Amino acid sequence: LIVTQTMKGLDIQKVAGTWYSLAMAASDISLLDAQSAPLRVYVEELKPTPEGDLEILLQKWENGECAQKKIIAEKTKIPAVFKIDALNENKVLVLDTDYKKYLLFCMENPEQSLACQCLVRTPEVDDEALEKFDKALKALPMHIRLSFNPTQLEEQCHI
Amino acid sequence: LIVTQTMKGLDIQKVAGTWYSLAMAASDISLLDAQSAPLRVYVEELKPTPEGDLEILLQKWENGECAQKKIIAEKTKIPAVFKIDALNENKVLVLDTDYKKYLLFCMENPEQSLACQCLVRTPEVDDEALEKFDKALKALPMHIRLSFNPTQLEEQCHI
Ligand SMILES: CCCCCCCCCCCCCCCCCC(=O)O
Ligand SMILES: CCCCCCCCCCCCCCCCCC(=O)O
């Protein structure tokens, strides 16, 4: 409920495939801090299920290694909002997407842990999708923001 | 030379006294990463010398402790640019200040390590000085940005 923006007319099937986590932002510094921080996650691919659920493939640093992760985001009544398994059932909200270039989403559990990403289809710095990410976030109370270069985008865990 | 903005008419005496590091930004993620990161420094006070040099009091996390530091920024021909001791003689540039509320500065060694801060006089979140900080930075190639709340501002090393 903290975020006042969701996409209308979302077709979840049409977000399937490859994405890059070009920018991330969060409400608290420590959510994004180190390579091992709790919401510091690098999206690899989205697989919508026929039921309209969302399989998410991602990377996360756990040892001093970049681990492979698989998560399922379950649908709700709202086409733009999903719930994750399971500890306090984390809500994922789709704010905006053109399916073909960018997607903006936020993850939350009006209090008040929040992380958001600007996803893009290709390993390039998209200024106008970053402008849209900054435009959507200037509302929210973010205290850390990270951006990645094309080199980092083609590496595991963006080193 | 990387930054295209400095303050004209700067009187270094009139920046003396108490400041808070409200926001920081940098060109590379790892410059600001953890509590121990190289340019992650919390400004406490500025003491201009009669010669027009600048004594800087600051905090930096070195052990798992917040250490007290003292540095001297030596003047140059340009009233807005100072050089620090001594390893590669780091240039500090004053971009803008109203002496009474905010100060924007950048620290650099056109390549291409760069960190900048929005300094303010009081432990409050100044939206219009943060707007000015974001306006001055949208030029520069920053990849990490951090913001602090009034609580953090009154603690050592902003915990
Ligand atoms: C549905 C359309 C957009 C989907 C975008 C992908 C959203 C990804 C949400 C992933 C959140 C996972 C939280 C962190 C889990 C990491 C596991 C861990 O805690 O170590
Ligand atoms: C002169 C007007 C504005 C002055 C603003 C203060 C600028 C502070 C510059 C300090 C840069 C120090 C670099 C990091 C030093 C920390 C020591 C270390 O490496 O452990």
Curated annotation (Swiss-Prot), chains A, B:
The keyword rRNA processing does not apply. Disulfide bonds join C66-C157, C106-C116, C106-C118. Keywords: Allergen, Disulfide bond, Milk protein, Retinol-binding, Secreted, Signal, Transport. InterPro entries: Blactoglobulin, Calycin, Lipocalin, Lipocalin_CS, Lipocln_cytosolic_FA-bd_dom. Belongs to the calycin superfamily. Lipocalin family. Primary component of whey, it binds retinol and is probably involved in the transport of that molecule. This is Beta-lactoglobulin. It comes from Bos taurus. The lineage of its organism: Eukaryota, Metazoa, Chordata, Craniata, Vertebrata.
